[PDB]
Design a binder for this molecule. Structure first.
Ligand SMILES: Nc1ncnc2c1ncn2[C@@H]1O[C@H](COP(=O)(O)OP(=O)(O)O)[C@@H](O)[C@H]1O
Ligand SMILES: [Mg+2]
Length: 538
């Protein structure tokens, strides 16, 4: 029939008597006020645009909670879509236009036109990041509030712009909220809409300068990454859509030329074959694009000395290690939301703490992939210089580089690691000359065994996927690197003692190996406190 969490226009008590009406209705034995929008296929907001706006409302509520209005699908009495709903956000006072009045109580206009310091007290960075995460184009004052956001009819700008009139880059993650590569039309930092109108836009521009605002931005990005439990989000979306198919053919009701625009511009997403498949599978496959994109930017971020606006940003491997409270807060916020807005929901669509832990374990592991690729690449490069000085034919081995951190085809972290296909003890022993042992001949054989074992241990631990990622796997990884360091660190740097730049090059590889063999210990990281980690570095 019609979805479980869908309503019917006949079930709505209008409080008045786009086409926005004020509405109330009954839910779980209590009334819930809301705002009603009616489908207008001939004035934008078609069926599949309205159908995407309700999925966005759910996606956002998973990591924002009550700060993102939940939307519903409303049908007529004959099971035909007619509009969408948007349950009122408790404590929504919206933002002012420069043409509207300026309240005379300073405590009431700090809610309508907020001061940059009051935005940090009310955690508005979490909201602005969510809009940027899903490429929102309508970040104009009335769609934003000091306690949440409500309007989603202009989300997924890269795929939805055609019914009105993804590339999240590291450069935007650095100087956020001053987005510039990702170009919205309305944004709080903008002074003039279309810059790449708020009465005081500079109040939002300063959030990129304040360091406390950047910590809230990181805590927001980590919430988006860790709350993502797809196994439930698929179940919860079917509560709002059921077996509804994608059905992009409904664009014919608006104009057949638009359907032709979509099947020609996006052939891999909305075609004859996908048009009959569930709308859930379509937008989930569409959401994972944004997730993998935000995952590449944040989890692999390696730091910055100065944003374009004043604050230095740490590498996420250091931010997670130095501040273990980030994860401890997401776990507390999850249990809170489990007994808050999910109290009446079933156990099978609640935050699973165990799954949330493995997710953080992944983000922990993958957040270190760069500094372990770097050590393996530095360890590779030094094995070549030794193979040049010891081999008869001055053999230099080629290194297949791994995919860059911003390549849009990158999903898991193990693809960041380069490989040396011919680096094997069985393949290098015959290449050595019995005429060039300055102790460099014994160093090559050692540094080959070292780099092989190193890469082998990284592989076994980085190929474990999230569903098979045991906290013991991180112990195995750490217990071997510490065994690797203790077995080769002395013998190798004793065999390079007589060299100059060649020895110092292995000093940095060993020093880094020791440091990040301990910083990466996950079981030990979960027992730390922000203050314990602030005094352990001095
Ligand atoms: N859940 C909600 N809570 C509070 N106000 C809302 C909600 N949904 C809509 N509104 C009101 O409706 C207006 C936005 O309606 P909508 O049609 O969704 O966006 P737009 O009008 O920009 O297309 C805002 O001015 C807002 O005050
Ligand atoms: Mg709108």
């Amino acid at each position: 029939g019609l979805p479980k969490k869908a309503l019917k226009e006949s079930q709505l008590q209008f409080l008045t008597a786009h086409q926005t009406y004020k509405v109330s209705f009954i839910e779980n034995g209590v009334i819930k006020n809301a705002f009603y929008k009616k489908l207008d296929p001939k004035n934008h907001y078609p069926e599949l645009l309205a159908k995407i706006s309700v999925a966005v409302s759910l996606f956002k509520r998973i990591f924002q909670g009550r700060r993102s209005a939940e939307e519903r699908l409303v049908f007529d009495d004959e099971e035909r879509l007619v509009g969408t709903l948007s349950i009122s956000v408790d404590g929504f006072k919206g933002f002012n236009f420069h043409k509207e009045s300026v309240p005379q109580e300073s405590s009431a206009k700090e809610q309508v036109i907020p001061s940059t310091r009051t935005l940090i007290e009310k955690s508005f960075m979490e909201i602005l990041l969510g809009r940027w995460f899903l490429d929102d184009d309508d970040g104009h004052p009335h769609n934003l509030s000091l306690a949440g956001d409500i309007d989603f009819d202009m989300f997924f700008y890269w795929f939805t712009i055609y019914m009105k009139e993804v590339n999240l880059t590291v450069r935007d993650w650095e100087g956020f909220p001053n987005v510039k590569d990702s170009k919205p039309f309305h944004w709080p930092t903008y002074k003039n809409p279309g810059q790449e109108t708020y009465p005081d836009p500079g109040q939002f521009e300063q959030l990129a300068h304040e360091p406390v605002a950047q910590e809230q931005k990181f805590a927001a990005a980590l919430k988006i990454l860790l709350t993502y439990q797809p196994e439930m989000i698929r179940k919860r979306l079917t509560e709002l859509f059921g077996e509804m198919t994608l059905n992009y053919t409904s664009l014919d009701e608006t104009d057949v030329a638009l359907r032709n625009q979509y099947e020609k511009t996006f052939p891999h997403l909305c075609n004859e074959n996908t048009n009959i498949k569930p709308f859930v599978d379509f937008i989930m496959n569409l959401y994972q694009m944004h997730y993998d994109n935000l995952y590449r930017v944040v989890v692999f971020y390696m730091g910055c000395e100065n944003n374009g606006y004043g604050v230095p940003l740490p590498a996420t491997n250091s931010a997670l290690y130095h501040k273990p409270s980030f994860y401890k807060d997401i776990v507390e916020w999850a249990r809170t939301q489990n007994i808050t807005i999910f109290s009446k929901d079933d156990s099978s669509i609640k935050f699973d703490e165990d799954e949330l832990r493995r997710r953080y374990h992944q983000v922990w592991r993958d957040a270190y992939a760069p500094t372990f690729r770097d050590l393996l690449h530095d360890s590779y490069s030094l094995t070549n210089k030794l193979l040049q000085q010891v081999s008869t034919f001055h053999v230099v081995l080629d290194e297949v580089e791994g995919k860059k951190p911003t390549d849009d085809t990158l999903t898991n972290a193990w693809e960041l690691f380069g490989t040396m296909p011919e680096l094997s003890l069985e393949k290098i022993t015959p290449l050595i000359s019995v005429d060039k042992d300055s102790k460099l001949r014994t160093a090559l054989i050692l540094l080959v065994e070292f780099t092989t074992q190193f890469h082998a241990v990284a592989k076994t631990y980085y190929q474990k996927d999230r569903k098979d990622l045991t906290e013991e796997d991180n112990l195995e990884f750490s217990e071997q690197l510490v065994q690797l360091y203790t077995n080769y660190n002395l013998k190798i740097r004793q065999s390079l003692a007589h060299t100059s730049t060649l020895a110092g090059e292995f000093n940095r590889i060993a020093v880094g190996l020791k440091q990040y063999t301990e910083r990466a210990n996950f079981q030990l990281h979960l027992t730390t406190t922000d203050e314990q980690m602030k005094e352990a570095t001095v």
